[PDB]
Amino acid sequence: QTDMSRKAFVFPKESDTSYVSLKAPLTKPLKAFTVCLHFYTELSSTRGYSIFSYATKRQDNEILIFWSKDIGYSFTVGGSEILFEVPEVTVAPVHICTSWESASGIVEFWVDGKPRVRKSLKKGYTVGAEASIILGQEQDSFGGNFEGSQSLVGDIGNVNMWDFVLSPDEINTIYLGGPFSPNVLNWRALKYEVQGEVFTKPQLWP
Amino acid sequence: QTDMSRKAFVFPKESDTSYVSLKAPLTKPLKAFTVCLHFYTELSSTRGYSIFSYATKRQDNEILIFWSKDIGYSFTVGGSEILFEVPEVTVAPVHICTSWESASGIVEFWVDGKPRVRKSLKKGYTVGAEASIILGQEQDSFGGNFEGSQSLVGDIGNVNMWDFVLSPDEINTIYLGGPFSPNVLNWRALKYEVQGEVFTKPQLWP
Amino acid sequence: QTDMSRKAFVFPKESDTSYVSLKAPLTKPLKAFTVCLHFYTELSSTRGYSIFSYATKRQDNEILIFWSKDIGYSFTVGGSEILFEVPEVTVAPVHICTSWESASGIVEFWVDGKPRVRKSLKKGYTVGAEASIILGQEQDSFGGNFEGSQSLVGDIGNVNMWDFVLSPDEINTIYLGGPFSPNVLNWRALKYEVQGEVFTKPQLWP
Amino acid sequence: QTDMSRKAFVFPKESDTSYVSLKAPLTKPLKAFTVCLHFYTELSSTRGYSIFSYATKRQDNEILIFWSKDIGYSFTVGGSEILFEVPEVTVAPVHICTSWESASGIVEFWVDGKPRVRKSLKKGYTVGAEASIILGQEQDSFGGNFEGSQSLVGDIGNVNMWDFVLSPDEINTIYLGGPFSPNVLNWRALKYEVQGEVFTKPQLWP
Amino acid sequence: QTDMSRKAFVFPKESDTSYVSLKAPLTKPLKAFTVCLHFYTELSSTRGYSIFSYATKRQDNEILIFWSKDIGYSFTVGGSEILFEVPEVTVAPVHICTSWESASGIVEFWVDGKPRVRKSLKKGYTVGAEASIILGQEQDSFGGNFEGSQSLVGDIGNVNMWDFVLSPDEINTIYLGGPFSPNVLNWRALKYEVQGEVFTKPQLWP
Numbered sequence A, B, C, D, E: 001q002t003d004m005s006r007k008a009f010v011f012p013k014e015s016d017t018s019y020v021s022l023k024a025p026l027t028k029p030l031k032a033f034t035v036c037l038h039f040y041t042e043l044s045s046t047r048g049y050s051i052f053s054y055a056t057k058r059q060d061n062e063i064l065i066f067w068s069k070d071i072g073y074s075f076t077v078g079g080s081e082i083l084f085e086v087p088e089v090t091v092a093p094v095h096i097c098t099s100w101e102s103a104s105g106i107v108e109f110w111v112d113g114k115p116r117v118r119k120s121l122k123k124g125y126t127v128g129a130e131a132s133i134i135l136g137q138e139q140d141s142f143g144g145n146f147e148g149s150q151s152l153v154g155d156i157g158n159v160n161m162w163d164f165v166l167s168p169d170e171i172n173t174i175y176l177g178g179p180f181s182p183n184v185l186n187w188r189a190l191k192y193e194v195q196g197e198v199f200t201k202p203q204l205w206p
């Protein structure tokens, strides 16, 4: 019931102890999902980092969004990874939405409201329910074994997660800032635990 | 009567077994034609691919639209090919309209509503009626004999065909999204058969 | 009285036998003139071509507009030539308006409604009335001796001619598309003769 | 009482004598602060310079804003420095806002109304009250020991200072030109002393 | 009282005989001045030229505005010169406004309504009243000893002069074609003498 509207988490130092852990209530296994977030960092030209870590007991990298230096975005599900290449790197806040479906196997990536081509990953796969969701590091185990080089220095916010694939119209609505009701992770009724040096401050982006 | 408005075909893998075959009812030979379609792919900098294949018993490549690496668009009628060069490649959905007339031999190409210079090809020629129209591969014979390296990975839609040449005003109307009534292939009353791994999903372009 | 509004001449092949000859009624010698036209061609990066050819018995090149490869526009009157250099070549329809005055010698050139610096050429010279006006090839005699390398492939239209110099306001009016009444060549009351492979088709530019 | 709206200070020559010294009334030690100013100079591609100098008896560089050639902006507090790199240099007036908070240690930088990533500097530190605030040179003692190479030649104005951090909405209001009431330095109620060749003239920027 | 609104002087050839001399009525020495003018030439990439020449018996270069190849604008007063460097060269009409004041020595330069940094030159200096103002060449004596290499080929107009410095608001008004009343040189009440080949034609710029 902690409303984090018009607020963002700030990691101002490079460390291996600062992070935030989010909690989801569901227990039914996931067959399709959508994740949307807003982030701002200046490490693109210096090294790679992690934007969203979702780990289960069996697999550490179950749903992970990564930035790889000189290559671009890396979306990994169930241990298998696809690359979305960006040639030019910009300095400004970035809004990313991602969606994955099981029966079809299609993966959709939206960067700042503009879609990328559709790819394929892990057809006929089930994502576990009991899991740890971490912002700040890229978990090599179940909520532990963090890596300093894979940390994030900057601001993160507007983290929402659904349990079904969103249509383009709803993605445009989210980008513009209309109303919506996520059913996995809600930015207006969020449960979280903060460990280390993490701060909560007004968001820079509009 | 399968209305396909606001929907598109998705090919998410490189294969030689996935395609869609469309059907047309007419039997009178064709002396002039127009084809308009929308597509999105990320293979421009990697290899060439087919966008529209039209095959008859005598000729495999009767009306074919192709992309040639480092060169640009290739329009082939009756086995004779002409080239429309594009030096700059952009990553975004593309709308193409093409028209051919027999008495004059003029060929008209419109990319995103902006026309290209008119060229000449295959004057005094008749295009057969009984034919196979395939999206997904470039048929080297009648339906079949598919080329693995000439497949299309990505999204395709808004395929419309007329049996007469269109004036610039009508092409502008098509680009902006007004009403029209094609008489060979209609995206509101389409007959089609899908083979392989081809999906039907909401369109990404507006 | 053949109204040629919303229409254009198309030369789709490179040849030395296709041209269009226009007729003018006046007989009083010329001491100042203005010529306005629209054209579209993709030969800028390959070779040169002639846009407007005007020839008399004494001089084959009385008023000629040319494009010289890697240099730019070339305006020649009475056999003497001046150059307007453009470093960047664009692919789109081009509207050019030129004007010359005798008592002063100033030559004005307008490309896409934006003027170029004023230059001097052939002061105190009279241009003959009995002449042949040709689009398609540059003339080396009185309506003959065409050169293949100097031909035009593409579209031409909106050819108008006045026997006096126009003010900038009227040039802007012409470019935008207002009304005017030329007194030498009128695109609404044109007399013409077509020889070879020349087609009359709806224009591409607005 | 000396309202300085629509006015600016001009240093037109490079010297080590010209400067302006401003006065602040408060005596309570500072735990957070914000500084906003507008400046215009053409020395970016030649050498460095100081935009805002704030010195105390213990340290000469307590709050100093600097420009370093080929690097960019340098914000130094308590003797510790952090860099904000700009690769592209432009010729136009620049508006800069900076903010520092002690409990968090976060430093915020805004250039032309667009925020930079948040960084960390000097957590748990107190800034003295009795201080000398100088525009024109970068002090190396308490109001003395100026350096010619570090002087500023150009225009400076719209200097305002608060003793608390500002929200992004208030920063946008300041940039647009709305009303506000600073409580340390007020451009409408300034106390100042001008020494050397410094002039007061209408501001160039809107 | 020869109103010259919507008219401009044209020099279409390079020579050392064509020029226009303007007359001013005042006899009180000058302590501050402002000069505004519009010009169009294509010689920037070829050589230098003079835009405004102001000469007296003692000094030939009293108020001279010049263009130096590969460097940019050169403003010279009383024989001492300062440079305003432009790295990029454009092809379009240019509007320049320059201002000088004696008590402070500040020199102000406005190109196309955008200010440049303020610089210092000739503090405590008086400009003579009895003088020759020439457009067309850069006088090396009292209205004589012209130089061909330093001539201007192109168009000039909207020449106005004030005997006091102008605030930025009035400069913006001038750039937008508002009303004003100069008291040294008035483009609506000009006294001029034309010698050589100089023409009066409608202005190209709006």
Ligand SMILES: C[C@@H]1O[C@@H](O[C@H]2[C@H](O[C@@H]3[C@@H](O)[C@@H](O)[C@@H](O[C@H]4[C@H](O)[C@@H](O)[C@H](O)O[C@@H]4CO)O[C@H]3C)O[C@H](CO)[C@H](O)[C@@H]2OP(=O)(O)OC(CO)CO)[C@H](O)[C@H](O)[C@H]1O
Residues within 6 Å of the ligand: A060, A061, A066, A074, A076, A081, A138, A139, A140, A150
């Ligand atoms: C434990 C293991 O972690 C993942 O591997 C990640 C790898 O990082 C290594 C650690 O995982 C850890 O094993 C060790 O590496 C040792 C390794 O354990 C040992 O067997 C071998 O002999 O020596 C290695 C030392 O180099 O320390 C680091 C190097 O990094 C690679 C990078 O490709 C993997 O991809 C994993 O990195 P990641 O967690 O950050 O995720 C990737 C980042 O892009 C995905 O994009 C494994 O994947 C398993 O989860 C687990 O078994």
Ligand SMILES: C[C@@H]1O[C@@H](O[C@H]2[C@H](O[C@@H]3[C@@H](O)[C@@H](O)[C@@H](O[C@H]4[C@H](O)[C@@H](O)[C@H](O)O[C@@H]4CO)O[C@H]3C)O[C@H](CO)[C@H](O)[C@@H]2OP(=O)(O)OC(CO)CO)[C@H](O)[C@H](O)[C@H]1O
Residues within 6 Å of the ligand: B060, B061, B066, B076, B138, B139, B140, B141, B145, B147, B150
């Ligand atoms: C004269 C032209 O010949 C063909 O040109 C195509 C050729 O592709 C080869 C064809 O031979 C194709 O049938 C296939 O043949 C295989 C196939 O298994 C079967 O025929 C035989 O048993 O084994 C053959 C082993 O190769 O092999 C391919 C490589 O090559 C040209 C260019 O070199 C074109 O690629 C043609 O194929 P395309 O469909 O892609 O043509 C497009 C036209 O623009 C490409 O732009 C044609 O098939 C016709 O026979 C004839 O026109």
Ligand SMILES: C[C@@H]1O[C@@H](O[C@H]2[C@H](O[C@@H]3[C@@H](O)[C@@H](O)[C@@H](O[C@H]4[C@H](O)[C@@H](O)[C@H](O)O[C@@H]4CO)O[C@H]3C)O[C@H](CO)[C@H](O)[C@@H]2OP(=O)(O)OC(CO)CO)[C@H](O)[C@H](O)[C@H]1O
Residues within 6 Å of the ligand: C060, C061, C066, C074, C138, C139, C140, C141, C145, C147, C150
């Ligand atoms: C008309 C006469 O010559 C013009 O020169 C043009 C020349 O074209 C050739 C002409 O000379 C033409 O008579 C013929 O040549 C004759 C001639 O007897 C002789 O050359 C030889 O015997 O062969 C022919 C038969 O006897 O062939 C043509 C090709 O080409 C030059 C090349 O620069 C000129 O440029 C003229 O051609 P152009 O129209 O294309 O000029 C363009 C202007 O930009 C080129 O850019 C000249 O105009 C003479 O002044 C004129 O008297």
Ligand SMILES: C[C@@H]1O[C@@H](O[C@H]2[C@H](O[C@@H]3[C@@H](O)[C@@H](O)[C@@H](O[C@H]4[C@H](O)[C@@H](O)[C@H](O)O[C@@H]4CO)O[C@H]3C)O[C@H](CO)[C@H](O)[C@@H]2OP(=O)(O)OC(CO)CO)[C@H](O)[C@H](O)[C@H]1O
Residues within 6 Å of the ligand: D059, D060, D061, D066, D074, D076, D079, D081, D138, D139, D140, D145
């Ligand atoms: C306390 C000392 O001074 C500041 O650091 C500046 C230093 O530059 C020197 C200045 O300190 C200045 O007084 C003088 O130095 C004296 C001093 O006695 C001693 O350092 C030297 O041996 O003799 C000099 C004459 O007595 O000369 C300058 C060079 O070190 C750096 C080097 O550039 C900077 O100059 C420091 O500050 P700055 O104002 O000069 O330049 C800015 C600093 O960021 C530009 O970024 C600080 O107080 C430090 O505590 C310490 O260095």
Ligand SMILES: C[C@@H]1O[C@@H](O[C@H]2[C@H](O[C@@H]3[C@@H](O)[C@@H](O)[C@@H](O[C@H]4[C@H](O)[C@@H](O)[C@H](O)O[C@@H]4CO)O[C@H]3C)O[C@H](CO)[C@H](O)[C@@H]2OP(=O)(O)OC(CO)CO)[C@H](O)[C@H](O)[C@H]1O
Residues within 6 Å of the ligand: E060, E061, E066, E076, E081, E138, E139, E140, E147
């Ligand atoms: C007297 C001199 O006049 C102007 O000088 C410009 C100079 O032009 C030369 C003149 O100096 C003129 O006397 C003569 O030069 C003499 C002189 O003895 C010497 O140059 C040479 O050895 O012998 C010549 C004949 O005996 O010839 C002309 C060309 O040239 C310089 C260098 O370019 C500048 O151009 C001088 O000023 P400017 O009018 O050309 O404008 C320049 C544009 O930037 C200045 O910025 C000037 O009025 C001098 O002040 C004055 O002393």
Ligand SMILES: [Ca+2]
Residues within 6 Å of the ligand: A060, A061, A138, A139, A140, A141
């Ligand atoms: Ca991991």
Ligand SMILES: [Ca+2]
Residues within 6 Å of the ligand: A138, A139, A140, A147, A150
């Ligand atoms: Ca790891």
Ligand SMILES: [Ca+2]
Residues within 6 Å of the ligand: B060, B061, B138, B139, B140, B141
């Ligand atoms: Ca084929």
Ligand SMILES: [Ca+2]
Residues within 6 Å of the ligand: B138, B139, B140, B146, B147, B150
């Ligand atoms: Ca093939």
Ligand SMILES: [Ca+2]
Residues within 6 Å of the ligand: C060, C061, C138, C139, C140, C141
């Ligand atoms: Ca000729």
Ligand SMILES: [Ca+2]
Residues within 6 Å of the ligand: C138, C139, C140, C146, C147, C150
């Ligand atoms: Ca010729």
Ligand SMILES: [Ca+2]
Residues within 6 Å of the ligand: D060, D061, D138, D139, D140, D141
């Ligand atoms: Ca110091």
Ligand SMILES: [Ca+2]
Residues within 6 Å of the ligand: D138, D139, D140, D147, D150
């Ligand atoms: Ca110093």
Ligand SMILES: [Ca+2]
Residues within 6 Å of the ligand: E060, E061, E138, E139, E140, E141
């Ligand atoms: Ca001189």
Ligand SMILES: [Ca+2]
Residues within 6 Å of the ligand: E138, E139, E140, E146, E147, E150
């Ligand atoms: Ca000279």
